[PDB]
Amino acid sequence: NSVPGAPNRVSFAKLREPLEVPGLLDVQTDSFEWLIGSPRWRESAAERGDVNPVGGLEEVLYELSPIEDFSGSMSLSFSDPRFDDVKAPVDECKDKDMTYAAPLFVTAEFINNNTGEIKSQTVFMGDFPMMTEKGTFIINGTERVVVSQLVRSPGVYFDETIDKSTDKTLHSVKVIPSRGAWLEFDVDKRDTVGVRIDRKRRQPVTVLLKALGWTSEQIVERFGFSEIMRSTLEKDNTVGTDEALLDIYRKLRPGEPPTKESAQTLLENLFFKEKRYDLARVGRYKVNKKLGLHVGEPITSSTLTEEDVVATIEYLVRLHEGQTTMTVPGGVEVPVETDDIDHFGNRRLRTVGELIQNQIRVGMSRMERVVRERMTTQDVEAITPQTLINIRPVVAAIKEFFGTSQLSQFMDQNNPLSGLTHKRRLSALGPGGLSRERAGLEVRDVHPSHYGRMCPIETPEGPNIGLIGSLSVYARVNPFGFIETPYRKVVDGVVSDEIVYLTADEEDRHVVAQANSPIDADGRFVEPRVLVRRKAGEVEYVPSSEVDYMDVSPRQMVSVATAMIPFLEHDDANRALMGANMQRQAVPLVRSEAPLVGTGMELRAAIDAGDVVVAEESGVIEEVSADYITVMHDNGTRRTYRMRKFARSNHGTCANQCPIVDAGDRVEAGQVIADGPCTDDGEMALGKNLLVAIMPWEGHNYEDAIILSNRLVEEDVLTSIHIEEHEIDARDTKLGAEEITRDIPNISDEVLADLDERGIVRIGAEVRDGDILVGKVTPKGETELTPEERLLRAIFGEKAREVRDTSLKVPHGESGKVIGIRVFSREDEDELPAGVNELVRVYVAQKRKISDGDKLAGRHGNKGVIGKILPVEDMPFLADGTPVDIILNTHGVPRRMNIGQILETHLGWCAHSGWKVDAAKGVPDWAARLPDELLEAQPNAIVSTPVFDGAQEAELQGLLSCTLPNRDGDVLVDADGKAMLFDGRSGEPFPYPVTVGYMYIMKLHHLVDDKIHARSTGPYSMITQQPLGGKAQFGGQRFGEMECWAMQAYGAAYTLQELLTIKSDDTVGRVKVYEAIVKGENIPEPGIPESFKVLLKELQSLCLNVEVL
Amino acid sequence: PGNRPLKSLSDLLKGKQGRFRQNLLGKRVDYSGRSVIVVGPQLKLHQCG
Amino acid sequence: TLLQDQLQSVLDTLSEREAGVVRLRFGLTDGQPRTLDEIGQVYGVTRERIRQIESKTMSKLRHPSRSQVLRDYL
Amino acid sequence: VQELFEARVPRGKAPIADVTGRVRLEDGERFYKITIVPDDGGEEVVYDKISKRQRLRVFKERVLSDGDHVEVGQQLMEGSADPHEVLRVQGPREVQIHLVREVQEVYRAQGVSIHDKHIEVIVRQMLRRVTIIDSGSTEFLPGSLIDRAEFEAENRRVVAEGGEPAAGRPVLMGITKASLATDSWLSAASF
């Protein structure tokens, strides 16, 4: 639907979709799209209001310029930031390990005050990383992604608390700007106020107010209504402006002689000097909105004007009096209520744009205080604009952000959906925000405002639940950073089509309708009443007159990864969350078959994932080949697409790609041309459809274990590809320079039958565990060999050498062909790190079959390892002779409340056999509603079932009584949906009909080849003699504490001591036991370790004489 | 360098890094491995794959 | 250690003199080498009467049987 | 369970009877007033404020009311009684049963079985020490905790030499505080 060449996936839905899904990747591209300032965003935020737009960079320069020294004799100004064209295209930048950027130019001008000059000079600011078409960045060849961050928005926050002593209500306020000072207006258990600005112990409201230039009469005039401040003024003890101004200054410093500076300069240099205290363009808006200030205004400023303060002051006193509304001279009346910190109306989302703008600003705040410092001590009249601009700090800051920053993460891409959902993520943790251990379980809970903005289902299971969430489908980011959602406004019970994006603030004030309401052909609520969501957040019920807004469609709450689970409204939240988190972990198979029964988010989430080569302009195919395709547009110029074949992903998967068109086909703009890793015909296909039964089979699938058939191994139905990358480097050492050469110290000649004449192996060599990949050799140095060895070299006429055999050998348990070999050299201009003459990398491919130990999983969160793989001949086979493929257990279905995975098992069979409603005289009651043209479907037909609007419990049962016979008229699955299986092992049939169907399962990326480990004796750390391993090093297992407790509970002293002494640290013990073992003698009885003759020395180093008696 | 306190002699005994707290915090050992597990419904009670 | 013991075993199969000759030449038992004439000092011979014997013994060791057990330690 | 083993004072404090006799209940301003008249009789014991949120207990006649005969350690209000008071009032052997029952009931409430010998092995480590209230004649500082065995074997060294009356009372102490003070210098140095 609304896609040129998409497949025809029948749908079970009943409602319409007035609004179609947005540009899922918009939150990254159209969000970036504001630092550069491309005309695209110009028109976007110029047609929908936005009187005057200013780019992300321009908004920095226009706050930096004009550079002015303290002498006031000269000035520097910046303007017109523009970008050139990129140097190297994406692909090349991904291959040569060079960062994908473009040049940045800013017009700079210096002017003198004595006489003045008009020197304008285009200053090159440096390289700037650009955002690829998919929304990711390329840094040093690695594809990284920036993740938006949730942060409470600067502004005014009120609140109230109860004291246990007297049990009254104390109403506090706070004003939190970006890079400023905080001043809570507390209201103590007693009176009167909590003026304690900048956290200095307190102050009285009349002090700061009067010090602002207020007569003691005006205070009682405005704020007397409102008598609680009468006591504040009475007990203030101070009369006059400076009489309390110098007291404020005292409490601030303290301990310094008061003056006229310490009285007025301070106050005017903490709130009204827009260089040390400035609340960003957002705060200046959240404050006006909260209070009833200039709100109707193009207003643009960052100084906390006196007025605002006074307002909030009385606001506070009005709160702890008992009232609802508040007004101010000339201001729009606002309601009085304590704000909530977690409400999605006070929690903005700094996207990838503001994070880069912040880094650019922090850099400018280093490159800025380098001109005005080299502006006085330079030769005046001899300086040119470029002579002052030391750009280096800015590029350094940028590179220090895109690297080593905990918000720039390697794009988790082992399949299209994992990549798509790595973007659109919002993590409340990270820099500038809260932490993971210092944030109580309040920011984790789901708030009734998250409906439509953040999905409540999708979230990690580890110690991050609630801290890392994902955007919804229809949501959209405001120009400030607040998340919006589209509603349809209904006027007088007549549902219209005027879509209106509401934020989180202006949603509670109104009344929101429900998605699935009985509208009758016009927009009239058939029934007299309707469900609603009132301000507070409760679920009320109202008449069909107050309803003004209504959701555009169900599944608004659901994210993208979640909107692909069929029958979601039948699964529990735990299992639904596990299913949503176990899809971004699947692996791309070799065939990539589409799912038989999914939802509408398949076709519309692959073309947006950025791994499906989409025809750009409607043309006609001219030539196709596994390597590339060419389209001949209707207007002359053609265009050649280059599909990437067998490219390694970041997690080791395969990035294959293959055309899906012929040499004559006509194509239109948007249509799919080449499939992706996990796509099929241009739509997500993460796994395969397998015939599954639901019986427990003789104890091989016990407690989540799964058994398979050999067919899935013979017919390459779950075979996957994996490409690993090994790397070695040859540097210069103290004795010389390491050389990568075919020559080697004492070694055989059968371990060189695959290395080319110059070391590195030849492409196509079937390597295995232990073999050699790169021939390296390092200078030995100089030593002196004992007799036994000199009398041995003489015998074998092999004079010794001065090199060590330190090559690059394949790690343990790894095989497969050698695909690619990359080589960089300092002698060949191939830039590399310091002290590195050469650097080689070797890619090894491997086709992994399914094997017991590999984890599998369906969409509904059900998972399990593969325990047994029976031959194809002993497996419960239907009456025809078709063996079931997988055999799931029953005891896992009921107690986990995921009966969803059963419904799709039933439907999965229907859509596999194909039905035809027998309504040739009249549509049966059960199926007189759902669609038309869905009363019959050819065998092996595709279908769809939207998340909360799909098939119905009473419809499957109607689609299960029409299951046309396979070849000879013989219905195999009776009405209830159960077959009569024959026991392939014993021969006779099972005594009860068993449930069978077609389930869509996926092979996760937790294969045993990754987990299996072992270590007999490896390398040990030098400082601490405990075992240690790395890439090609075993590593050693960790015998923790509770294990020692268990050992002691057994009373096994010798085993514990052995695990503690001759296996971890005792160097004289490990070798003395290894020698015994290898010689076949008795293991020496564990004595007292040598780690006890070191405690005595460490004590005696303190003048403590400890003696063993 | 870095305006950090240097570890004195007492720091060889105190804290979770000292000698006293050494053998208690557990330590990784040799002749060990790990792996994923499955069901062995044909194994006896005293066997394992 | 196994290498030392295997050297001892192999050298125990040669003549009564040649064993000590090779030892004192490469300084196995005592620990310090000896010049060509130094060893013969105790055998009443000179440079050649020692060097010829030493060379012939080395050629003997190079035989495949002798080097079969030692070739791997190298 | 953690509050039972830590030997804290239960936030839902419940006052326990101190002397046998009669009981006089008086209402008041939002909590209570309870004066136990000693069966001796003589000096009565007075509990001032038993918040109305903390209702009355029950006892076997019925929901205990005014004028009722309460025994030595019969609980007065519902909630949780602190082990220190029950120890001071009814002896150690009663505090052991109290702790064991309070833990085993919390465990039974979940369908878990733990034989009492485990909880007893754990409790035995709590009632080992005595607090030296009267330093007496032998070097024992007031308010310090000393092991019962040692405190008794030292006063066993009371060969006349001047009557050394080292007076101390048993002390119930949580697991943490009881483990802080050990007899091996390095074992404690490892904390």
Side-chain angles (χ1 to χ4, degrees), chain A residues 2-69 71-209 211-242 244-246 248-274 277-302 304-305 307 309-434 436-440 442-444 446-534 536-537 539-768 770-781 783-826 828-917 919-1030 1032 1034-1109, chain B, chain C residues 1-67 69-74, chain D residues 1-51 54-182 184-191:
Chain A
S2 66
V3 173
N8 186 32
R9 184 176 300 269
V10 180
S11 180
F12 269 79
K14 273 69 175 181
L15 302 72
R16 286 188 172 183
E17 298 288 349
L19 177 54
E20 51 181 326
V21 187
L24 296 166
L25 283 178
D26 274 4
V27 66
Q28 288 288 175
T29 70
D30 277 68
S31 175
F32 182 69
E33 214 65 79
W34 162 86
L35 188 61
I36 290 184
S38 173
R40 288 194 45 71
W41 165 92
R42 182 77 58 181
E43 166 272 4
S44 180
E47 291 293 274
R48 59 145 168 172
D50 313 4
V51 172
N52 281 76
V54 294
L57 293 173
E58 308 180 12
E59 186 181 20
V60 178
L61 280 22
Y62 296 165
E63 87 163 346
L64 220 307
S65 173
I67 292 293
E68 180 179 354
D69 64 349
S71 176
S73 54
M74 56 182 58
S75 63
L76 177 53
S77 172
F78 295 142
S79 177
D80 183 73
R82 89 174 196 272
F83 298 94
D84 284 324
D85 290 339
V86 297
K87 45 190 51 51
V90 181
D91 187 9
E92 181 177 9
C93 295
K94 221 178 303 181
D95 180 7
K96 302 182 181 303
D97 298 6
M98 57 176 57
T99 183
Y100 173 89
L104 201 177
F105 282 144
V106 184
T107 294
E109 180 177 353
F110 170 81
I111 285 188
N112 182 11
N113 285 341
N114 299 328
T115 172
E117 291 171 338
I118 311 180
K119 294 176 178 177
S120 292
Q121 188 180 10
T122 294
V123 182
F124 168 87
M125 274 303 180
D127 282 327
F128 204 76
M130 298 305 177
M131 178 173 298
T132 38
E133 300 303 348
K134 278 58 182 303
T136 73
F137 291 131
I138 292 72
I139 309 307
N140 304 131
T142 55
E143 191 159 6
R144 316 182 61 91
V145 164
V146 176
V147 175
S148 46
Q149 174 185 358
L150 291 173
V151 300
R152 65 177 181 271
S153 63
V156 303
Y157 296 157
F158 296 81
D159 48 324
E160 164 273 358
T161 63
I162 297 178
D163 94 83
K164 306 309 176 183
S165 58
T166 144
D167 315 3
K168 58 172 54 183
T169 65
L170 29 161
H171 298 74
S172 169
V173 74
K174 175 151 45 277
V175 174
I176 50 181
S178 57
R179 191 187 75 266
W182 293 20
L183 48 160
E184 305 74 322
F185 294 2
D186 274 63
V187 174
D188 295 310
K189 162 179 57 185
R190 68 182 184 272
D191 293 12
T192 73
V193 305
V195 191
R196 158 172 37 94
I197 122 185
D198 202 332
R199 311 179 183 90
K200 306 175 180 180
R201 230 64 247 93
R202 187 153 291 254
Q203 269 117 75
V205 289
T206 181
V207 161
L208 171 50
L209 174 47
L212 190 63
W214 276 63
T215 65
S216 299
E217 187 279 348
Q218 299 159 329
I219 297 182
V220 182
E221 192 286 334
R222 275 211 64 190
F223 301 165
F225 54 102
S226 277
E227 106 294 347
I228 303 181
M229 38 226 314
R230 301 309 309 277
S231 304
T232 94
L233 181 53
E234 303 307 323
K235 309 195 304 177
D236 75 335
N237 112 309
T238 311
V239 169
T241 65
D242 304 325
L245 184 40
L246 61 80
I248 287 297
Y249 172 74
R250 304 173 179 272
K251 286 303 174 59
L252 270 47
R253 275 302 188 271
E256 186 163 345
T259 62
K260 308 304 179 180
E261 168 276 356
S262 57
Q264 181 143 36
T265 69
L266 198 57
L267 275 294
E268 303 172 0
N269 291 17
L270 283 191
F271 297 83
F272 309 80
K273 175 174 63 69
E274 61 148 276
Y277 177 102
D278 280 333
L279 70 187
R281 192 170 194 266
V282 173
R284 222 299 84 85
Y285 164 88
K286 274 296 303 181
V287 180
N288 297 159
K289 173 52 65 286
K290 174 68 170 184
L291 295 179
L293 289 194
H294 318 271
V295 300
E297 276 288 6
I299 34 67
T300 175
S301 69
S302 59
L304 209 195
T305 184
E307 171 187 7
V309 173
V310 314
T312 177
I313 311 172
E314 61 100 302
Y315 203 100
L316 199 235
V317 74
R318 293 184 56 82
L319 170 53
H320 185 15
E321 194 175 24
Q323 301 206 24
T324 171
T325 183
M326 179 279 190
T327 178
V328 74
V332 187
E333 57 181 5
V334 189
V336 182
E337 74 168 7
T338 67
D339 300 5
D340 189 351
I341 296 75
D342 301 340
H343 189 271
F344 239 24
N346 305 335
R347 201 180 185 185
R348 63 187 302 265
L349 174 62
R350 291 205 305 270
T351 171
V352 58
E354 186 175 7
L355 295 183
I356 306 282
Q357 188 175 62
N358 282 12
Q359 296 301 154
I360 282 187
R361 172 187 302 102
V362 72
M364 292 298 187
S365 294
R366 305 184 195 276
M367 173 270 179
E368 167 262 32
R369 61 166 312 287
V370 172
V371 181
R372 82 198 320 171
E373 173 267 11
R374 77 164 53 181
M375 213 174 184
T376 67
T377 164
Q378 273 292 69
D379 190 79
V380 59
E381 177 51 16
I383 59 187
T384 190
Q386 179 172 354
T387 46
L388 304 172
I389 296 179
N390 178 263
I391 109 282
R392 279 177 54 257
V394 148
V395 62
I398 284 294
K399 161 186 175 299
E400 183 271 358
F401 166 79
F402 279 101
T404 71
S405 184
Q406 44 188 342
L407 258 50
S408 179
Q409 316 169 3
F410 288 89
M411 171 178 171
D412 173 19
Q413 55 175 353
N414 48 10
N415 57 332
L417 198 169
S418 57
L420 168 53
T421 58
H422 189 186
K423 303 174 270 287
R424 307 174 51 85
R425 184 181 296 180
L426 3 168
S427 56
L429 45 66
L434 55 73
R436 195 169 80 177
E437 190 182 19
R438 294 181 56 180
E442 288 68 13
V443 305
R444 299 169 177 259
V446 304
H447 191 92
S449 65
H450 290 339
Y451 185 108
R453 303 168 176 76
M454 199 175 59
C455 184
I457 309 303
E458 184 177 20
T459 178
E461 290 183 8
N464 288 334
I465 305 190
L467 294 181
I468 288 186
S470 61
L471 231 176
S472 306
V473 177
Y474 292 74
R476 180 174 59 97
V477 165
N478 225 19
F480 296 105
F482 300 95
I483 307 187
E484 291 184 332
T485 306
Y487 298 108
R488 316 157 58 177
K489 75 173 311 175
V490 58
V491 188
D492 304 332
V494 170
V495 171
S496 62
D497 293 330
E498 297 176 345
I499 297 182
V500 181
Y501 285 74
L502 299 184
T503 168
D505 302 325
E506 50 189 350
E507 176 182 328
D508 310 0
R509 186 179 306 95
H510 305 182
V511 135
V512 186
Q514 195 62 330
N516 50 14
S517 296
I519 294 184
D520 175 80
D522 302 65
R524 325 194 68 88
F525 292 74
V526 174
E527 46 197 15
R529 316 214 67 180
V530 175
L531 248 180
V532 78
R533 281 185 299 160
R534 192 156 275 82
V539 185
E540 206 169 357
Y541 204 146
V542 105
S544 62
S545 69
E546 314 172 24
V547 167
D548 25 348
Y549 294 144
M550 176 174 57
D551 302 335
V552 309
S553 74
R555 96 182 53 86
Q556 279 199 12
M557 46 176 301
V558 160
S559 58
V560 144
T562 290
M564 302 168 49
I565 289 185
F567 305 86
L568 181 50
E569 64 289 23
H570 295 288
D571 297 357
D572 193 1
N574 308 338
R575 315 312 294 190
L577 184 168
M578 299 192 179
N581 271 328
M582 294 176 68
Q583 288 182 347
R584 77 172 61 90
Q585 284 183 11
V587 307
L589 316 194
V590 298
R591 303 291 289 195
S592 181
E593 171 185 345
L596 206 52
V597 46
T599 137
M601 286 299 300
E602 258 88 1
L603 177 276
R604 187 60 170 81
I607 72 90
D608 285 328
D611 296 11
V612 180
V613 181
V614 187
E616 172 54 9
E617 187 175 348
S618 63
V620 48
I621 293 292
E622 176 167 317
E623 179 213 294
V624 309
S625 167
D627 293 2
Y628 62 81
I629 303 183
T630 59
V631 284
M632 161 73 70
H633 307 272
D634 296 330
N635 301 339
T637 65
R638 312 97 57 87
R639 208 289 184 73
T640 68
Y641 304 102
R642 307 289 316 295
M643 31 202 61
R644 47 200 280 92
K645 305 292 296 184
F646 297 92
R648 175 184 196 274
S649 182
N650 292 339
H651 292 242
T653 62
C654 175
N656 195 13
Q657 211 156 114
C658 59
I660 80 174
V661 283
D662 302 331
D665 314 2
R666 176 89 169 93
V667 311
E668 303 75 348
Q671 178 178 1
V672 167
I673 291 179
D675 291 336
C678 287
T679 64
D680 156 82
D681 196 356
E683 59 179 358
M684 291 290 298
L686 297 169
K688 295 288 182 57
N689 322 269
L690 284 58
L691 189 70
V692 56
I694 312 277
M695 56 177 308
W697 198 72
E698 296 191 3
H700 283 299
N701 58 340
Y702 166 89
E703 200 161 8
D704 296 61
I706 292 177
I707 78 191
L708 302 178
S709 303
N710 216 30
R711 187 182 70 84
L712 310 188
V713 172
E714 300 173 357
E715 298 181 3
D716 285 331
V717 83
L718 288 185
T719 305
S720 65
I721 293 179
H722 292 266
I723 307 183
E724 186 163 348
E725 160 183 339
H726 312 102
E727 179 169 355
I728 190 59
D729 55 356
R731 306 180 182 176
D732 301 329
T733 181
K734 276 72 71 174
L735 175 54
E738 305 174 349
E739 180 180 3
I740 303 180
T741 182
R742 188 173 194 173
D743 185 69
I744 280 302
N746 49 6
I747 184 53
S748 174
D749 197 2
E750 181 59 11
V751 309
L752 176 142
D754 275 330
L755 290 65
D756 74 340
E757 82 303 347
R758 52 82 91 105
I760 45 76
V761 313
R762 288 180 293 191
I763 291 75
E766 176 87 12
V767 312
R768 52 84 125 274
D771 300 333
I772 297 75
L773 299 175
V774 182
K776 179 181 175 65
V777 67
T778 57
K780 171 72 72 303
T783 59
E784 50 215 24
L785 308 315
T786 54
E788 292 68 345
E789 186 173 357
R790 176 175 56 272
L791 165 59
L792 200 61
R793 300 294 174 83
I795 291 183
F796 297 164
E798 290 194 350
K799 52 208 307 175
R801 207 175 305 180
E802 74 298 6
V803 302
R804 284 179 48 82
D805 181 7
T806 161
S807 181
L808 167 53
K809 298 180 295 298
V810 44
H812 287 259
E814 284 170 333
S815 55
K817 315 286 191 177
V818 181
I819 278 188
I821 308 183
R822 224 56 169 81
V823 58
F824 307 138
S825 176
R826 166 69 57 84
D828 301 351
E829 304 178 4
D830 295 320
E831 186 280 338
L832 27 60
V836 170
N837 293 20
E838 206 161 8
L839 185 287
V840 58
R841 287 197 286 259
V842 183
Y843 299 115
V844 191
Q846 184 186 5
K847 288 179 57 184
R848 302 182 176 186
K849 300 277 187 55
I850 199 66
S851 173
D852 45 4
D854 302 315
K855 186 171 180 182
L856 256 62
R859 271 99 70 83
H860 308 271
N862 59 325
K863 49 186 177 177
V865 309
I866 298 183
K868 175 74 175 175
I869 305 182
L870 307 319
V872 49
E873 64 274 11
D874 44 45
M875 187 86 65
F877 60 83
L878 303 174
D880 319 337
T882 313
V884 307
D885 293 332
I886 72 180
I887 298 185
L888 299 177
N889 190 334
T890 287
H891 302 254
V893 180
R895 56 188 176 92
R896 310 183 189 281
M897 303 308 303
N898 62 17
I899 38 64
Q901 79 168 0
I902 295 299
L903 304 184
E904 86 157 323
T905 288
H906 290 336
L907 211 200
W909 180 251
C910 295
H912 163 83
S913 66
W915 60 97
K916 158 175 279 64
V917 178
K921 34 67 56 61
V923 178
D925 178 67
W926 87 78
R929 176 176 303 91
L930 27 43
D932 190 332
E933 67 80 271
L934 223 189
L935 316 183
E936 57 93 274
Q938 208 56 8
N940 198 319
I942 318 179
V943 290
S944 69
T945 58
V947 186
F948 290 137
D949 176 73
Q952 216 65 24
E953 53 173 340
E955 291 187 23
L956 298 169
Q957 172 182 162
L959 287 180
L960 217 46
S961 64
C962 167
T963 172
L964 291 307
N966 44 329
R967 297 217 227 97
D968 3 329
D970 188 4
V971 178
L972 295 178
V973 172
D974 67 338
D976 294 332
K978 310 176 182 183
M980 279 267 49
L981 308 178
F982 288 174
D983 184 5
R985 182 176 290 190
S986 60
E988 302 178 354
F990 289 149
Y992 300 95
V994 174
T995 283
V996 312
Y998 266 95
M999 192 177 179
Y1000 178 89
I1001 65 178
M1002 351 171 297
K1003 161 181 182 173
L1004 274 51
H1005 193 171
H1006 282 352
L1007 318 181
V1008 298
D1009 307 311
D1010 312 320
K1011 322 289 80 182
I1012 184 182
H1013 301 330
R1015 169 172 187 177
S1016 58
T1017 296
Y1020 307 103
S1021 177
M1022 183 187 184
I1023 272 49
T1024 177
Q1025 294 294 331
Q1026 290 172 2
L1028 155 150
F1034 320 87
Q1037 193 62 200
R1038 177 168 187 87
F1039 190 73
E1041 186 178 20
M1042 300 175 295
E1043 298 81 6
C1044 298
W1045 291 347
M1047 298 264 49
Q1048 295 174 17
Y1050 274 115
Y1054 290 102
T1055 313
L1056 169 58
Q1057 186 181 15
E1058 175 177 349
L1059 291 186
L1060 289 180
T1061 59
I1062 76 180
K1063 289 186 189 174
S1064 53
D1065 294 359
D1066 198 69
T1067 299
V1068 313
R1070 291 173 302 178
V1071 54
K1072 233 57 185 180
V1073 66
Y1074 188 97
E1075 165 178 342
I1077 276 188
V1078 178
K1079 285 185 173 182
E1081 298 178 353
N1082 299 342
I1083 313 296
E1085 191 289 329
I1088 291 69
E1090 177 182 331
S1091 176
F1092 165 75
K1093 300 168 52 184
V1094 178
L1095 183 53
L1096 269 51
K1097 298 302 179 182
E1098 296 187 6
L1099 295 181
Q1100 303 183 353
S1101 299
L1102 281 306
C1103 298
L1104 295 182
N1105 165 32
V1106 305
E1107 63 199 290
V1108 49
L1109 297 184
Chain B
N3 280 13
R4 66 174 189 88
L6 294 74
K7 323 305 294 183
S8 54
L9 279 175
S10 298
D11 288 332
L12 305 182
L13 289 58
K14 195 187 314 172
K16 75 173 184 298
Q17 316 288 189
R19 279 297 136 78
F20 295 110
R21 198 93 113 283
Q22 162 177 278
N23 300 21
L24 302 175
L25 299 182
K27 50 179 61 176
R28 40 180 61 96
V29 306
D30 291 333
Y31 301 100
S32 65
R34 71 173 173 178
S35 176
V36 63
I37 54 177
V38 308
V39 55
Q42 73 292 12
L43 313 192
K44 301 303 183 53
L45 182 43
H46 67 255
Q47 295 167 338
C48 88
Chain C
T1 306
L2 311 188
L3 163 56
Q4 287 190 182
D5 298 337
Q6 189 59 200
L7 239 302
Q8 228 66 305
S9 175
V10 156
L11 277 58
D12 291 353
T13 59
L14 311 190
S15 81
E16 190 68 344
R17 302 192 315 170
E18 293 154 353
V21 179
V22 188
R23 293 180 179 173
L24 302 181
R25 182 56 186 177
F26 291 76
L28 301 187
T29 173
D30 47 327
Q32 181 60 359
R34 312 300 188 94
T35 55
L36 293 184
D37 166 71
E38 217 312 310
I39 37 191
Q41 186 76 3
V42 60
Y43 285 150
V45 309
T46 67
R47 262 60 66 86
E48 197 60 15
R49 188 44 184 176
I50 281 302
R51 197 190 67 77
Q52 62 172 196
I53 294 185
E54 234 303 338
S55 57
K56 203 58 185 61
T57 303
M58 307 298 294
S59 56
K60 288 186 178 64
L61 296 184
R62 290 177 174 81
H63 184 73
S65 74
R66 310 293 174 76
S67 167
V69 303
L70 302 176
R71 184 45 163 267
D72 198 332
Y73 289 155
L74 212 190
Chain D
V1 163
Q2 181 176 350
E3 150 190 350
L4 284 180
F5 280 139
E6 211 69 16
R8 294 171 192 168
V9 173
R11 64 175 187 175
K13 209 295 179 182
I16 66 171
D18 296 325
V19 58
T20 57
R22 76 172 308 274
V23 62
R24 172 171 54 92
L25 176 158
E26 295 182 344
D27 257 71
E29 52 174 288
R30 311 219 70 93
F31 350 88
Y32 254 143
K33 161 52 57 177
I34 301 186
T35 312
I36 300 180
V37 183
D39 201 343
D40 302 355
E43 182 180 7
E44 299 177 4
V45 179
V46 180
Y47 309 104
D48 319 71
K49 300 181 182 178
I50 301 177
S51 297
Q54 176 176 347
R55 73 199 63 169
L56 298 183
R57 187 53 197 280
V58 207
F59 98 94
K60 263 41 126 259
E61 230 12 300
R62 35 73 231 187
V63 21
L64 147 163
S65 300
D66 195 336
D68 193 354
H69 181 75
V70 176
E71 301 306 351
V72 176
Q74 169 58 34
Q75 184 180 5
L76 277 49
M77 299 296 182
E78 73 171 341
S80 306
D82 70 75
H84 295 286
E85 246 53 17
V86 39
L87 170 55
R88 171 185 63 89
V89 179
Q90 200 166 6
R93 180 60 190 89
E94 178 61 353
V95 158
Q96 305 173 343
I97 301 307
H98 172 59
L99 291 175
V100 171
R101 207 199 314 101
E102 298 300 343
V103 180
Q104 194 64 205
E105 194 172 2
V106 164
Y107 269 133
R108 302 170 190 176
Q110 293 292 166
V112 178
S113 302
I114 298 300
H115 193 254
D116 277 1
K117 54 181 56 178
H118 307 289
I119 294 174
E120 292 176 347
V121 171
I122 281 300
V123 174
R124 152 195 178 93
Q125 305 297 133
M126 291 181 175
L127 302 180
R128 297 183 53 75
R129 297 188 180 266
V130 309
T131 179
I132 287 301
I133 296 182
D134 284 329
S135 295
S137 177
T138 172
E139 280 58 20
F140 289 161
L141 298 70
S144 64
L145 302 187
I146 293 183
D147 178 82
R148 175 186 301 167
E150 188 267 17
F151 161 89
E152 295 176 341
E154 120 76 46
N155 279 14
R156 186 58 33 77
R157 168 180 146 262
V158 70
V159 307
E161 294 187 353
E164 48 197 62
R169 306 174 170 178
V171 184
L172 184 286
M173 50 186 174
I175 50 181
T176 311
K177 176 190 173 185
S179 64
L180 281 179
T182 177
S184 52
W185 51 269
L186 65 180
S187 173
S190 162
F191 286 157

